[PDB]
Amino acid sequence: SHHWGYGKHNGPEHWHKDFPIAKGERQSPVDIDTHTAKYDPSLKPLSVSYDQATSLRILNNGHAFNVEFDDSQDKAVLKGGPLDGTYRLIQFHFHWGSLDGQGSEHTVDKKKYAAELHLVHWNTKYGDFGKAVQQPDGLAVLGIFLKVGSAKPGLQKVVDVLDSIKTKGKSADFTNFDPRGLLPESLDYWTYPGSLTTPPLLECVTWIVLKEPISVSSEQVLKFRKLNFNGEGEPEELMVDNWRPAQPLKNRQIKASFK
Numbered sequence: 001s002h003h004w005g006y007g008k009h010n011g012p013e014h015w016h017k018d019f020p021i022a023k024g025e026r027q028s029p030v031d032i033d034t035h036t037a038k039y040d041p042s043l044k045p046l047s048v049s050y051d052q053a054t055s056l057r058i059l060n061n062g063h064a065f066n067v068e069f070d071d072s073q074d075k076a077v078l079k080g081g082p083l084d085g086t087y088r089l090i091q092f093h094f095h096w097g098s099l100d101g102q103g104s105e106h107t108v109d110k111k112k113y114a115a116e117l118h119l120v121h122w123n124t125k126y127g128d129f130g131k132a133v134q135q136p137d138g139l140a141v142l143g144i145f146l147k148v149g150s151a152k153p154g155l156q157k158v159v160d161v162l163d164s165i166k167t168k169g170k171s172a173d174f175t176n177f178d179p180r181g182l183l184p185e186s187l188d189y190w191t192y193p194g195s196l197t198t199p200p201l202l203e204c205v206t207w208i209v210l211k212e213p214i215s216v217s218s219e220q221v222l223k224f225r226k227l228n229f230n231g232e233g234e235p236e237e238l239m240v241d242n243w244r245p246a247q248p249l250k251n252r253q254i255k256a257s258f259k
């Protein structure tokens with residue numbers, strides 16, 4: 001059974017023993033060297049189309065929490081940029097730290113942010129998510145950095161429900177949530193081919209990382225840190241530092257959408 005996690009005894013340094021692709025040629029996350037990344041005029045305009053997004057549920061899965069969407073039709077999609085075709089939003093989740101100085105998976109000139117939001121989308125040409133993850137262009141993950149400053153009003157409904165999903169395996173209704181409230185103003189981005197950042201670490205992701213972070217309040221991120229990795233009635237292990245460090249870039253170039 002899966003026994004990977006984020007602690008010393010089951011964390012990122014151990015994953016390769018059960019998921020050998022951990023040492024592969026297109027692993028994520030990576031450090032984004034802003035000086036080396038090059039503007040790419042071949043990138044088409046990015047299109048985030050979340051007007052009809054239909055959120056359903058929030059789940060503590062023992063690694064993070066997922067806000068899940070109805071992906072039975074093209075209700076919320078990501079298109080354009082580096083992407084060929086249509087990618088359907090299935091869920092979002094975050095990675096975060098024990099302290100404000102760490103928590104992001106991607107880094108920017110080695111800078112770590114307090115957290116990172118991942119909006120996960122699958123390529124509809126493959127019919128279902130399970131099939132999409134087996135393809136090199138199966139998923140598009142829109143990554144957004146979080147820094148601590150002023151509160152993000154569009155985040156507060158997420159923060160407010162976390163008390164009800166404290167432990168692994170708990171879920172709650174989470175209908176009528178607008179994910180557009182989690183974006184920054186600018187859609188400037190970096191893009192590169194990579195992988196899932198958790199086991200099974202499949203090399204199926206086109207990464208699109210927004211340059212502009214969102215600001216959240218210290219009080220908002222503190223509430224993330226009250227979640228538990230453990231299940232109900234088990235010894236408390238705070239859900240903090242659920243991030244994989246940067247992996248070798250190898251034979252990849254990071255492209256910028258902006259001049």
Ligand SMILES: NS(=O)(=O)c1ccc([Se]C2CCCCC2)cc1
Nearest residue numbers: 003004009010014015016017018
């Ligand atoms: N290669 S891995 O999937 O990361 C992985 C790592 C460790 C273990 Se067992 C370990 C779990 C923590 C408590 C002590 C016993 C199984 C699988």
Ligand SMILES: NS(=O)(=O)c1ccc([Se]C2CCCCC2)cc1
Nearest residue numbers: 118120133141195196197198200
């Ligand atoms: N952190 S992340 O790279 O956005 C990311 C996104 C989605 C998942 Se779900 C996983 C379930 C088993 C089959 C493969 C997909 C993990 C990690």
Ligand SMILES: [Zn+2]
Nearest residue numbers: 093095118197
């Ligand atoms: Zn993630």
